[PDB]
């Protein structure tokens, strides 16, 4: 991903999430800060796990 | 029941009801589908 406007907070707001866990950033401070560089992951698998 | 937690993110913890970050004392929760369903649609939130 790059040369993006993401707006951050209409997704851990308006959106149906389990779990939310941000490791070394914190969730109300991502609408300020520039990234220089992001990817991104996606599966699917068992929620014991 | 996890954003009734002392710093949170969500429009129930945004939006609705906040506790202080030094917050003293607990939070208790119990399930009841037995009594608030029907469905019943007065239960309202501030989107």
Known sequence: ISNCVADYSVLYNSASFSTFKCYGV?????????????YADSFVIRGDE | VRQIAPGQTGKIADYNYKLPD??????????????????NYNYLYRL
């Open chain 1, 26 to 38: 914190s969730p109300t401070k991502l609408n300020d800060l520039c990234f220089t560089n992001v």
């Open chain 2, 22 to 39: 030094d917050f003293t004392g607990c939070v208790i929760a119990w399930n009841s589908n037995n009594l608030d369903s029907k469905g």
